[PDB]
A paper describes a structure:
We show that lipoteichoic acids (LTAs) but not wall teichoic acids are D-alanylated in Lactiplantibacillus plantarumNC8 cell envelope and demonstrate that DltE is a D-Ala carboxyesterase removing D-Ala from LTA. The domain consists of two subdomains, an α-β sandwich (residues 76–126 and 246–397) that form a five strand (β1–β5) antiparallel β-sheet flanked by 5 α-helices (α2, α9–α12) and an α-helix-rich region (residues 127–245) folding in 6 α-helices (α3-α8).
Besides the apo form structure, we obtained two other DltE structures in complex with tartrate or TCEP (Tris(2-carboxyethyl)phosphine hydrochloride), two compounds arising from the crystallization conditions. Intriguingly, these two molecules are anchored by an interaction network that involves eight different residues, among which are the conserved active site nucleophile Ser128 and the base Tyr213 (Ser 62 and Tyr 159 in DDCP). Importantly, the catalytic Ser128 with the hydroxyl group of its side chain positioned at only 2.7 Å away from a carboxylic group of TCEP and tartrate is ideally placed as it would activate a substrate for the enzyme acylation event as described for DDCP. This suggests that the tartrate and TCEP molecule may mimic the nature and position of the natural substrate of DltE in its active site and that the acylation/deacylation step of the catalytic reaction is probably preserved in DltE. This arginine is key for the recognition of the terminal carboxylate of the peptide substrate and the carboxypeptidase activity. Instead, residues specific to DltE (Tyr338, His347, Arg345, and Leu349) stabilize the TCEP or tartrate molecules. Taken collectively, our structural data suggest that DltE would not be able to recognize the D-Ala-D-Ala terminal end of a stem peptide as DDCP does and that DltE would not be a DD-carboxypeptidase.
Numbering used by the authors: 49 to 396
Write the structure that this text describes.
């Protein structure tokens, strides 16, 4: 219907994006702003080159009703980009000698009837046959979010060992962090990421964003322009059910800091970062990110938000775009991809 039309409009936007020039004898602000304006971007945009911020600008409204404009320090949902952080949490446990990537899931989830042999390595690479079709419709504490998933997950033998995206893999990994450490995931995340890296605009949505908050907006089918006519709800249960997988908010700077710190070896040895970030035979995905010849990427979608990061192998050069106004017909990822490609060539 309009669904199909929206995919087509987005293809056409990617076309116009991909055919924009980009020269380094022209002002960075002007060129990036032109590309963001093409997609009618709403949110905040960060471009870093050899660790220097070269573009940092916000567009549209954090909360239109309250006349609050998005700011460079606005907070957005990182969504699935949190999986890369859960992945690093697991590999920290590997480095500390507390788990192995060859461990079978049945070591941690003894009640599972099928897929018991599935390794932690496979869960980290999206090469498992597990799927959770939906979480609990009522708010559950972490231990019960984990219990729900372990008892409600499907297993598909056809999908064992081949890349197929399934979020429950990372919820279950978060439950393994809980079991091994005896800590909550929220506490683990706070000490290992928030405290460690001095993140001041990072937290869990279930506890509120505080200052510089944003509101998620709902687009009607096939719309490209932001009208802010409808907010997108997210219940407490939906936030709880994103344990390990998409329950965190960050500023663009805080997201860049985490992903960069990972690659620079600040949280985990460079050797273990490389072991973690290893693609598979069937997919670029490995260890919670997509692995490319020219760095990593991760993308998130939900609750009216979209998030995107592209980052160079050494962590010093990249693009973060986050939006509180997802539109299928005006996605942000192709824009971030093009900026990153140009940035890595030397064209900015």
């Amino acid at each position: 219907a309009l669904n199909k039309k929206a995919a087509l409009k987005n293809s056409q936007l990617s076309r116009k994006i991909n055919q924009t020039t980009f020269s380094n004898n022209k002002n960075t602000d002007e060129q990036v702003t032109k590309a963001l304006n093409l997609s009618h971007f709403v949110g905040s945009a960060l471009v870093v080159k050899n660790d220097h911020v070269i573009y940092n600008r916000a567009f549209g409204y954090a909360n239109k009703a309250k006349n609050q404009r998005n700011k460079v320090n606005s907070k957005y949902q990182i969504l699935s980009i949190q999986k890369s952080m859960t992945a690093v949490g697991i590999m920290q446990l590997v480095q500390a000698g507390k788990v192995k990537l060859t461990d079978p899931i049945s070591k941690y989830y003894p009640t599972l009837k099928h897929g018991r042999q599935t390794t932690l390595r496979q869960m980290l690479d999206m090469t498992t046959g597990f799927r959770l079709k939906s979480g609990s419709k009522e708010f559950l504490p972490e231990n019960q979010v984990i219990d729900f998933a372990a008892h409600n997950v499907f297993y598909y033998p056809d999908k064992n060992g081949i890349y197929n995206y399934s979020s429950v893999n990372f919820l279950l990994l978060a439950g393994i962090i809980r079991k091994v450490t005896g800590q909550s995931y929220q506490h683990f995340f706070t000490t290992h990421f928030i405290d460690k890296l001095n993140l001041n605009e990072t937290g869990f949505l279930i506890h509120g964003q505080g200052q510089d908050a944003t509101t998620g907006y709902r687009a009607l089918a096939d719309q490209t322009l932001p009208n802010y006519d409808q907010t997108m709800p997210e219940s407490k249960s939906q936030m709880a059910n994103e344990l390990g997988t998409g329950q965190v908010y960050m500023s663009t700077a805080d997201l860049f800091t985490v992903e960069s710190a990972i690659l620079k070896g600040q949280l985990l040895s460079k050797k273990n970062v490389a072991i973690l970030h290893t693609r598979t035979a069937t997919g670029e995905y490995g260890g919670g990110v997509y692995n490319m010849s020219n760095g990593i990427r991760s993308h998130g979608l939900g609750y009216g938000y979209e998030s995107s990061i592209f980052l160079s192998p050494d962590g010093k050069t990249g693009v973060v775009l986050m939006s509180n106004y997802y539109r299928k017909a005006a996605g942000i990822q192709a824009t971030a991809n093009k900026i990153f490609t140009e940035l890595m060539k030397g064209d900015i």
